[PDB]
Design a protein around this ligand. Sequence first.
Ligand SMILES: Nc1ncnc2c1ncn2[C@@H]1O[C@H](COP(=O)(O)OP(=O)(O)NP(=O)(O)O)[C@@H](O)[C@H]1O
Ligand SMILES: [Mg+2]
Lengths: 217, 219
Amino acid sequence: ADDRTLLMAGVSHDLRTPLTRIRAYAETIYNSLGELDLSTLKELAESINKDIEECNAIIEQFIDYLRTGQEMPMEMADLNAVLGEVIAAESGYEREIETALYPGSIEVKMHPLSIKRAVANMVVNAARYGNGWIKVSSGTEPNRAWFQVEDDGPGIAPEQRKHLFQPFVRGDSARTISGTGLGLAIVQRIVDNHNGMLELGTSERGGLSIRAWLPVP
Amino acid sequence: ADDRTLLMAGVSHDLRTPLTRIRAYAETIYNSLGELDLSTLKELAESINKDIEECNAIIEQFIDYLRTGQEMPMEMADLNAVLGEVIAAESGYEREIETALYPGSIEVKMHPLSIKRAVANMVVNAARYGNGWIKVSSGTEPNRAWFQVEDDGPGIAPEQRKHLFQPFVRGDSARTISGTGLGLAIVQRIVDNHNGMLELGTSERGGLSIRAWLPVPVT
Ligand SMILES: Nc1ncnc2c1ncn2[C@@H]1O[C@H](COP(=O)(O)OP(=O)(O)NP(=O)(O)O)[C@@H](O)[C@H]1O
Ligand SMILES: [Mg+2]
Protein backbone atom coordinates (compact mmCIF):
# COMPACT_ATOMS: atom_id res chain seq x y z
CA ALA A 1 0.00 0.00 0.00
CA ASP A 2 2.66 2.49 1.10
CA ASP A 3 5.75 1.84 -1.07
CA ARG A 4 3.19 2.61 -3.77
CA THR A 5 2.03 5.92 -2.27
CA LEU A 6 5.61 7.10 -1.90
CA LEU A 7 6.16 6.10 -5.51
CA MET A 8 3.04 8.01 -6.63
CA ALA A 9 4.51 11.04 -4.83
CA GLY A 10 7.72 10.67 -6.82
CA VAL A 11 5.78 10.43 -10.06
CA SER A 12 3.88 13.64 -9.41
CA HIS A 13 7.21 15.29 -8.48
CA ASP A 14 8.96 14.14 -11.68
CA LEU A 15 6.01 15.41 -13.68
CA ARG A 16 6.49 19.04 -12.57
CA THR A 17 9.42 19.95 -14.88
CA PRO A 18 7.91 18.59 -18.13
CA LEU A 19 4.57 20.12 -17.19
CA THR A 20 5.91 23.59 -16.37
CA ARG A 21 7.84 23.57 -19.62
CA ILE A 22 4.76 22.78 -21.69
CA ARG A 23 2.70 25.58 -20.14
CA ALA A 24 5.68 27.84 -20.88
CA TYR A 25 5.96 26.99 -24.58
CA ALA A 26 2.21 27.06 -24.75
CA GLU A 27 2.17 30.53 -23.27
CA THR A 28 4.75 32.09 -25.61
CA ILE A 29 2.91 30.69 -28.61
CA TYR A 30 -0.25 32.21 -27.16
CA ASN A 31 1.27 35.69 -26.87
CA SER A 32 3.69 35.73 -29.80
CA LEU A 33 1.51 34.68 -32.69
CA GLY A 34 2.21 37.85 -34.67
CA GLU A 35 5.88 37.69 -33.66
CA LEU A 36 7.27 34.24 -34.42
CA ASP A 37 9.10 32.40 -37.18
CA LEU A 38 7.38 29.22 -38.38
CA SER A 39 10.65 27.35 -37.76
CA THR A 40 10.58 28.23 -34.08
CA LEU A 41 6.83 27.92 -33.60
CA LYS A 42 7.34 24.38 -34.87
CA GLU A 43 10.26 23.67 -32.61
CA LEU A 44 7.99 24.78 -29.65
CA ALA A 45 5.17 22.41 -30.82
CA GLU A 46 7.69 19.60 -31.37
CA SER A 47 9.20 20.02 -27.93
CA ILE A 48 5.72 20.09 -26.32
CA ASN A 49 5.14 16.72 -27.88
CA LYS A 50 8.47 15.30 -26.75
CA ASP A 51 7.50 16.32 -23.21
CA ILE A 52 3.97 14.94 -23.34
CA GLU A 53 5.59 11.62 -24.31
CA GLU A 54 7.88 11.83 -21.31
CA CYS A 55 4.86 12.24 -19.06
CA ASN A 56 2.79 9.43 -20.57
CA ALA A 57 5.83 7.17 -20.11
CA ILE A 58 6.07 7.67 -16.35
CA ILE A 59 2.36 7.55 -15.74
CA GLU A 60 1.93 4.41 -17.78
CA GLN A 61 4.95 2.93 -16.07
CA PHE A 62 3.32 3.55 -12.67
CA ILE A 63 -0.08 2.15 -13.67
CA ASP A 64 1.68 -0.96 -14.92
CA TYR A 65 3.46 -1.29 -11.58
CA LEU A 66 0.14 -0.85 -9.84
CA ARG A 67 -1.50 -3.64 -11.86
CA THR A 68 1.41 -5.86 -10.94
CA GLY A 69 -0.09 -6.08 -7.45
CA GLN A 70 -3.40 -7.62 -8.52
CA GLU A 71 -4.17 -11.11 -9.82
CA MET A 72 -5.01 -11.29 -13.53
CA PRO A 73 -6.91 -13.84 -15.63
CA MET A 74 -4.42 -16.27 -17.20
CA GLU A 75 -5.02 -18.01 -20.52
CA MET A 76 -3.22 -20.00 -23.19
CA ALA A 77 -1.54 -17.74 -25.71
CA ASP A 78 1.25 -17.77 -28.30
CA LEU A 79 4.32 -16.06 -26.90
CA ASN A 80 5.54 -15.16 -30.41
CA ALA A 81 2.35 -13.33 -31.33
CA VAL A 82 2.65 -11.24 -28.17
CA LEU A 83 6.28 -10.41 -28.82
CA GLY A 84 5.35 -9.60 -32.41
CA GLU A 85 2.79 -7.03 -31.36
CA VAL A 86 5.06 -5.24 -28.89
CA ILE A 87 8.00 -5.24 -31.32
CA ALA A 88 5.82 -3.54 -33.94
CA ALA A 89 4.70 -0.93 -31.43
CA GLU A 90 8.17 -0.22 -30.02
CA SER A 91 9.40 -0.53 -33.54
CA GLY A 92 10.54 2.92 -34.68
CA TYR A 93 12.65 4.74 -37.25
CA GLU A 94 14.34 6.14 -34.14
CA ARG A 95 15.33 2.54 -33.18
CA GLU A 96 15.70 -0.64 -35.24
CA ILE A 97 14.86 -3.95 -33.65
CA GLU A 98 16.35 -7.26 -34.76
CA THR A 99 13.72 -10.03 -34.69
CA ALA A 100 14.97 -13.59 -34.35
CA LEU A 101 11.95 -15.49 -33.08
CA TYR A 102 11.70 -19.22 -32.55
CA PRO A 103 10.09 -20.53 -35.75
CA GLY A 104 7.14 -22.25 -34.13
CA SER A 105 4.29 -21.23 -31.88
CA ILE A 106 4.99 -21.35 -28.14
CA GLU A 107 1.96 -21.79 -25.85
CA VAL A 108 2.42 -20.49 -22.33
CA LYS A 109 -0.06 -19.62 -19.61
CA MET A 110 -0.05 -15.81 -19.23
CA HIS A 111 -1.90 -12.55 -18.89
CA PRO A 112 -1.07 -11.15 -22.36
CA LEU A 113 -1.27 -7.47 -21.50
CA SER A 114 1.12 -7.96 -18.58
CA ILE A 115 3.65 -9.77 -20.78
CA LYS A 116 3.40 -7.07 -23.44
CA ARG A 117 4.41 -4.54 -20.80
CA ALA A 118 7.33 -6.57 -19.51
CA VAL A 119 8.59 -6.87 -23.06
CA ALA A 120 8.10 -3.16 -23.73
CA ASN A 121 10.05 -2.07 -20.65
CA MET A 122 12.91 -4.38 -21.58
CA VAL A 123 12.99 -2.77 -25.02
CA VAL A 124 13.10 0.84 -23.81
CA ASN A 125 15.72 -0.07 -21.21
CA ALA A 126 17.70 -1.64 -24.02
CA ALA A 127 17.21 1.53 -26.08
CA ARG A 128 18.59 3.69 -23.25
CA TYR A 129 21.53 1.57 -22.11
CA GLY A 130 22.32 0.57 -25.71
CA ASN A 131 23.97 2.22 -28.74
CA GLY A 132 21.04 1.55 -31.12
CA TRP A 133 21.09 -2.20 -31.73
CA ILE A 134 18.32 -4.16 -30.08
CA LYS A 135 17.62 -7.88 -30.59
CA VAL A 136 14.50 -9.68 -29.46
CA SER A 137 14.40 -13.46 -29.58
CA SER A 138 12.38 -16.37 -28.18
CA GLY A 139 12.68 -20.10 -27.79
CA THR A 140 11.69 -23.11 -25.78
CA GLU A 141 12.84 -26.21 -23.96
CA PRO A 142 10.82 -29.25 -22.98
CA ASN A 143 9.82 -27.67 -19.63
CA ARG A 144 10.14 -23.92 -19.99
CA ALA A 145 9.98 -21.20 -22.65
CA TRP A 146 11.83 -17.90 -22.88
CA PHE A 147 12.11 -14.55 -24.55
CA GLN A 148 15.04 -12.14 -24.33
CA VAL A 149 16.23 -8.70 -25.37
CA GLU A 150 19.80 -7.67 -26.03
CA ASP A 151 21.52 -4.33 -26.51
CA ASP A 152 24.99 -3.27 -27.73
CA GLY A 153 25.40 -1.12 -24.60
CA PRO A 154 28.08 -1.02 -21.91
CA GLY A 155 27.20 -4.38 -20.39
CA ILE A 156 26.30 -4.19 -16.72
CA ALA A 157 28.65 -5.97 -14.29
CA PRO A 158 27.13 -8.46 -11.78
CA GLU A 159 27.71 -5.81 -9.05
CA GLN A 160 25.62 -3.00 -10.56
CA ARG A 161 23.27 -5.76 -11.73
CA LYS A 162 21.58 -5.93 -8.31
CA HIS A 163 20.89 -2.18 -7.98
CA LEU A 164 19.25 -2.16 -11.41
CA PHE A 165 15.76 -2.96 -10.10
CA GLN A 166 15.62 0.15 -7.89
CA PRO A 167 12.86 2.66 -8.82
CA PHE A 168 14.25 5.39 -6.49
CA VAL A 169 17.61 7.10 -7.17
CA ARG A 170 20.18 7.90 -4.44
CA GLY A 171 21.91 10.86 -6.15
CA ASP A 172 18.86 13.15 -6.29
CA SER A 173 19.65 14.21 -9.83
CA ALA A 174 16.51 16.39 -9.50
CA ARG A 175 14.44 13.27 -10.24
CA THR A 176 12.85 11.15 -7.54
CA ILE A 177 12.41 8.20 -9.92
CA SER A 178 14.48 6.04 -12.23
CA GLY A 179 12.41 5.01 -15.28
CA THR A 180 14.99 2.36 -16.09
CA GLY A 181 14.86 0.95 -12.56
CA LEU A 182 11.09 1.08 -12.15
CA GLY A 183 10.75 -0.58 -15.56
CA LEU A 184 12.94 -3.55 -14.66
CA ALA A 185 11.22 -3.77 -11.28
CA ILE A 186 7.92 -3.98 -13.17
CA VAL A 187 9.37 -6.75 -15.36
CA GLN A 188 10.72 -8.56 -12.30
CA ARG A 189 7.25 -8.53 -10.70
CA ILE A 190 5.39 -9.59 -13.86
CA VAL A 191 7.72 -12.52 -14.48
CA ASP A 192 7.23 -13.57 -10.84
CA ASN A 193 3.45 -13.39 -11.09
CA HIS A 194 3.86 -15.82 -14.01
CA ASN A 195 6.06 -18.14 -11.91
CA GLY A 196 9.02 -17.41 -14.16
CA MET A 197 12.46 -16.01 -13.48
CA LEU A 198 14.70 -13.37 -15.01
CA GLU A 199 18.25 -14.07 -16.05
CA LEU A 200 20.74 -11.34 -16.86
CA GLY A 201 24.03 -11.50 -18.74
CA THR A 202 26.20 -10.16 -21.54
CA SER A 203 24.91 -10.07 -25.11
CA GLU A 204 26.47 -11.07 -28.45
CA ARG A 205 27.73 -7.51 -28.88
CA GLY A 206 28.99 -7.05 -25.29
CA GLY A 207 25.89 -5.24 -23.99
CA LEU A 208 23.17 -6.28 -21.56
CA SER A 209 20.96 -9.29 -22.23
CA ILE A 210 17.95 -9.98 -20.09
CA ARG A 211 16.02 -13.22 -20.53
CA ALA A 212 12.67 -14.13 -19.03
CA TRP A 213 11.86 -17.79 -18.43
CA LEU A 214 8.28 -19.05 -18.23
CA PRO A 215 6.76 -22.43 -17.45
CA VAL A 216 5.24 -24.53 -20.21
CA PRO A 217 2.18 -26.55 -19.13
CA ALA B 1 -7.16 -1.76 1.54
CA ASP B 2 -8.14 -2.70 -2.01
CA ASP B 3 -9.63 0.83 -2.22
CA ARG B 4 -6.39 2.82 -1.81
CA THR B 5 -5.25 1.21 -5.07
CA LEU B 6 -8.13 2.39 -7.20
CA LEU B 7 -7.59 5.90 -5.74
CA MET B 8 -4.01 5.94 -6.97
CA ALA B 9 -4.96 4.31 -10.24
CA GLY B 10 -7.60 6.97 -10.63
CA VAL B 11 -5.13 9.83 -10.30
CA SER B 12 -2.51 8.62 -12.80
CA HIS B 13 -5.19 7.29 -15.12
CA ASP B 14 -7.07 10.59 -15.18
CA LEU B 15 -3.90 12.57 -15.77
CA ARG B 16 -3.67 11.07 -19.27
CA THR B 17 -6.97 12.43 -20.57
CA PRO B 18 -5.74 16.06 -20.65
CA LEU B 19 -2.21 15.21 -21.80
CA THR B 20 -3.65 13.23 -24.71
CA ARG B 21 -5.81 16.16 -25.75
CA ILE B 22 -2.59 18.17 -25.80
CA ARG B 23 -0.87 15.82 -28.24
CA ALA B 24 -3.87 16.52 -30.48
CA TYR B 25 -3.41 20.31 -30.28
CA ALA B 26 0.41 20.29 -30.48
CA GLU B 27 0.36 18.14 -33.62
CA THR B 28 -2.24 20.19 -35.47
CA ILE B 29 0.01 23.23 -34.91
CA TYR B 30 3.07 21.26 -35.96
CA ASN B 31 1.38 20.40 -39.27
CA SER B 32 -1.00 23.26 -40.00
CA LEU B 33 1.55 26.01 -39.46
CA GLY B 34 1.35 27.81 -42.80
CA GLU B 35 -2.43 27.62 -42.89
CA LEU B 36 -3.51 28.70 -39.39
CA ASP B 37 -4.56 32.22 -38.41
CA LEU B 38 -4.22 34.15 -35.14
CA SER B 39 -7.75 33.56 -33.86
CA THR B 40 -7.51 29.76 -33.88
CA LEU B 41 -3.82 29.30 -33.13
CA LYS B 42 -4.34 31.50 -30.06
CA GLU B 43 -7.22 29.22 -29.12
CA LEU B 44 -5.23 26.00 -29.53
CA ALA B 45 -2.62 27.44 -27.19
CA GLU B 46 -5.24 28.51 -24.65
CA SER B 47 -6.66 24.98 -24.70
CA ILE B 48 -3.21 23.59 -23.92
CA ASN B 49 -2.92 25.95 -20.93
CA LYS B 50 -6.32 24.92 -19.63
CA ASP B 51 -5.44 21.24 -19.90
CA ILE B 52 -2.09 21.75 -18.18
CA GLU B 53 -3.97 23.43 -15.28
CA GLU B 54 -6.20 20.41 -15.07
CA CYS B 55 -3.13 18.22 -14.69
CA ASN B 56 -1.90 20.31 -11.80
CA ALA B 57 -5.35 20.32 -10.25
CA ILE B 58 -5.31 16.54 -10.29
CA ILE B 59 -1.80 16.42 -8.86
CA GLU B 60 -2.74 19.00 -6.22
CA GLN B 61 -5.80 17.02 -5.13
CA PHE B 62 -3.61 14.00 -4.44
CA ILE B 63 -1.04 15.96 -2.43
CA ASP B 64 -3.82 17.51 -0.35
CA TYR B 65 -5.14 14.03 0.29
CA LEU B 66 -1.69 13.12 1.58
CA ARG B 67 -1.62 15.89 4.18
CA THR B 68 -5.37 16.11 4.89
CA GLY B 69 -6.39 12.45 4.64
CA GLN B 70 -9.50 13.89 3.01
CA GLU B 71 -9.73 13.18 -0.70
CA MET B 72 -12.91 14.86 -2.04
CA PRO B 73 -13.73 18.08 -0.10
CA MET B 74 -17.43 18.66 -0.83
CA GLU B 75 -19.18 21.96 -1.61
CA MET B 76 -22.07 23.51 -3.49
CA ALA B 77 -21.31 24.04 -7.16
CA ASP B 78 -22.94 24.29 -10.55
CA LEU B 79 -22.95 20.86 -12.16
CA ASN B 80 -23.58 22.42 -15.59
CA ALA B 81 -20.46 24.56 -15.29
CA VAL B 82 -18.39 21.41 -14.89
CA LEU B 83 -20.24 19.71 -17.72
CA GLY B 84 -19.70 22.64 -20.10
CA GLU B 85 -16.04 22.65 -19.16
CA VAL B 86 -15.66 19.01 -20.24
CA ILE B 87 -17.87 19.42 -23.29
CA ALA B 88 -15.69 22.33 -24.42
CA ALA B 89 -12.38 20.56 -23.79
CA GLU B 90 -13.44 17.34 -25.48
CA SER B 91 -15.10 18.77 -28.57
CA GLY B 92 -12.73 20.01 -31.27
CA TYR B 93 -13.23 21.16 -34.84
CA GLU B 94 -13.12 17.47 -35.75
CA ARG B 95 -15.50 16.26 -33.04
CA GLU B 96 -18.81 17.92 -32.13
CA ILE B 97 -20.65 16.99 -28.92
CA GLU B 98 -24.43 17.35 -28.75
CA THR B 99 -25.91 19.03 -25.75
CA ALA B 100 -29.17 18.92 -23.85
CA LEU B 101 -28.24 20.58 -20.60
CA TYR B 102 -30.79 21.82 -18.09
CA PRO B 103 -31.35 25.59 -18.40
CA GLY B 104 -29.67 27.72 -15.77
CA SER B 105 -27.64 26.07 -13.08
CA ILE B 106 -27.85 23.00 -10.90
CA GLU B 107 -26.47 23.44 -7.42
CA VAL B 108 -25.22 20.16 -6.09
CA LYS B 109 -23.05 19.11 -3.22
CA MET B 110 -19.94 17.79 -4.97
CA HIS B 111 -16.17 17.75 -5.26
CA PRO B 112 -16.13 19.50 -8.67
CA LEU B 113 -12.79 18.22 -9.99
CA SER B 114 -13.63 14.61 -9.22
CA ILE B 115 -16.90 14.90 -11.07
CA LYS B 116 -15.13 16.60 -13.94
CA ARG B 117 -12.89 13.52 -14.08
CA ALA B 118 -15.88 11.17 -14.06
CA VAL B 119 -17.56 13.04 -16.90
CA ALA B 120 -14.33 13.05 -18.90
CA ASN B 121 -13.99 9.27 -18.70
CA MET B 122 -17.55 8.80 -19.88
CA VAL B 123 -16.98 11.15 -22.82
CA VAL B 124 -13.63 9.71 -23.98
CA ASN B 125 -15.26 6.27 -23.99
CA ALA B 126 -18.16 7.59 -26.03
CA ALA B 127 -15.62 8.68 -28.58
CA ARG B 128 -13.57 5.51 -28.17
CA TYR B 129 -16.42 2.99 -28.59
CA GLY B 130 -18.90 5.11 -30.52
CA ASN B 131 -19.16 6.21 -34.13
CA GLY B 132 -18.79 9.95 -33.71
CA TRP B 133 -22.12 10.93 -32.13
CA ILE B 134 -21.93 11.95 -28.49
CA LYS B 135 -24.62 13.62 -26.42
CA VAL B 136 -24.31 15.14 -22.99
CA SER B 137 -27.47 15.99 -21.07
CA SER B 138 -28.40 17.01 -17.54
CA GLY B 139 -31.58 17.58 -15.59
CA THR B 140 -33.05 17.54 -12.11
CA GLU B 141 -35.89 16.06 -10.07
CA PRO B 142 -37.61 16.63 -6.71
CA ASN B 143 -34.57 15.45 -4.71
CA ARG B 144 -32.02 14.37 -7.32
CA ALA B 145 -29.86 15.78 -10.10
CA TRP B 146 -28.39 13.92 -13.04
CA PHE B 147 -26.08 14.02 -16.00
CA GLN B 148 -25.71 11.47 -18.79
CA VAL B 149 -23.52 10.86 -21.80
CA GLU B 150 -24.72 8.85 -24.80
CA ASP B 151 -22.89 7.38 -27.83
CA ASP B 152 -24.05 5.69 -31.04
CA GLY B 153 -21.77 2.67 -30.53
CA PRO B 154 -22.81 -0.90 -29.73
CA GLY B 155 -23.79 -0.22 -26.11
CA ILE B 156 -22.97 -2.69 -23.33
CA ALA B 157 -25.05 -5.85 -22.99
CA PRO B 158 -26.56 -6.00 -19.47
CA GLU B 159 -24.89 -9.37 -18.76
CA GLN B 160 -21.48 -7.67 -19.16
CA ARG B 161 -22.05 -4.62 -17.03
CA LYS B 162 -21.22 -5.74 -13.48
CA HIS B 163 -18.16 -7.53 -14.84
CA LEU B 164 -16.80 -4.44 -16.59
CA PHE B 165 -16.93 -2.09 -13.57
CA GLN B 166 -14.05 -4.06 -12.07
CA PRO B 167 -10.64 -2.44 -12.23
CA PHE B 168 -8.18 -3.60 -14.89
CA VAL B 169 -10.93 -5.41 -16.72
CA ARG B 170 -11.29 -4.66 -20.39
CA GLY B 171 -13.85 -5.85 -22.96
CA ASP B 172 -13.26 -8.57 -25.55
CA SER B 173 -15.14 -6.18 -27.84
CA ALA B 174 -12.76 -3.61 -26.38
CA ARG B 175 -9.65 -5.77 -27.07
CA THR B 176 -9.64 -4.25 -30.61
CA ILE B 177 -9.54 -0.76 -29.06
CA SER B 178 -6.62 0.31 -26.79
CA GLY B 179 -7.04 0.95 -23.02
CA THR B 180 -6.67 -0.05 -19.36
CA GLY B 181 -10.01 -1.20 -17.98
CA LEU B 182 -10.19 1.61 -15.46
CA GLY B 183 -12.48 4.44 -16.65
CA LEU B 184 -15.72 2.89 -15.46
CA ALA B 185 -14.14 1.55 -12.29
CA ILE B 186 -13.08 5.12 -11.46
CA VAL B 187 -16.38 6.67 -12.46
CA GLN B 188 -18.15 4.30 -10.10
CA ARG B 189 -15.93 5.08 -7.15
CA ILE B 190 -16.28 8.81 -7.73
CA VAL B 191 -20.05 8.54 -7.94
CA ASP B 192 -20.15 6.25 -4.86
CA ASN B 193 -18.13 8.71 -2.79
CA HIS B 194 -20.94 11.22 -3.61
CA ASN B 195 -23.54 8.71 -2.47
CA GLY B 196 -24.84 8.75 -6.04
CA MET B 197 -26.02 6.05 -8.38
CA LEU B 198 -24.97 5.02 -11.88
CA GLU B 199 -27.56 3.81 -14.34
CA LEU B 200 -26.53 2.19 -17.67
CA GLY B 201 -28.89 1.83 -20.62
CA THR B 202 -29.24 2.10 -24.38
CA SER B 203 -28.78 5.50 -25.95
CA GLU B 204 -31.09 7.36 -28.34
CA ARG B 205 -29.31 5.46 -31.15
CA GLY B 206 -28.60 2.04 -29.66
CA GLY B 207 -25.29 2.87 -27.99
CA LEU B 208 -24.43 3.06 -24.30
CA SER B 209 -26.34 5.57 -22.22
CA ILE B 210 -24.64 6.12 -18.90
CA ARG B 211 -26.24 8.35 -16.32
CA ALA B 212 -25.11 9.49 -12.92
CA TRP B 213 -27.64 10.51 -10.29
CA LEU B 214 -26.64 12.79 -7.45
CA PRO B 215 -28.51 13.54 -4.24
CA VAL B 216 -29.64 17.15 -3.69
CA PRO B 217 -29.88 17.81 0.03
CA VAL B 218 -32.79 19.77 1.49
CA THR B 219 -32.19 22.34 4.28
N1 LIG C 1 -19.53 3.87 -24.47
C1 LIG C 1 -19.31 2.55 -24.59
N2 LIG C 1 -19.87 1.81 -25.59
C2 LIG C 1 -19.58 0.50 -25.66
N3 LIG C 1 -18.75 -0.13 -24.79
C3 LIG C 1 -18.14 0.51 -23.78
C4 LIG C 1 -18.40 1.94 -23.63
N4 LIG C 1 -17.69 2.35 -22.57
C5 LIG C 1 -17.02 1.27 -22.06
N5 LIG C 1 -17.30 0.18 -22.80
C6 LIG C 1 -16.80 -1.19 -22.53
O1 LIG C 1 -16.52 -1.35 -21.13
C7 LIG C 1 -15.16 -1.73 -20.93
C8 LIG C 1 -14.60 -1.06 -19.69
O2 LIG C 1 -14.16 0.27 -19.95
P1 LIG C 1 -13.21 1.04 -18.89
O3 LIG C 1 -13.07 0.31 -17.57
O4 LIG C 1 -13.77 2.41 -19.02
O5 LIG C 1 -11.69 1.07 -19.41
P2 LIG C 1 -11.26 1.14 -20.95
O6 LIG C 1 -12.16 2.12 -21.68
O7 LIG C 1 -11.19 -0.26 -21.45
N6 LIG C 1 -9.72 1.66 -20.79
P3 LIG C 1 -9.24 3.05 -20.06
O8 LIG C 1 -10.36 4.05 -20.20
O9 LIG C 1 -8.04 3.49 -20.88
O10 LIG C 1 -8.84 2.65 -18.65
C9 LIG C 1 -14.44 -1.33 -22.21
O11 LIG C 1 -13.26 -2.12 -22.42
C10 LIG C 1 -15.52 -1.52 -23.26
O12 LIG C 1 -15.62 -2.87 -23.69
MG1 LIG D 1 -12.75 4.16 -20.67
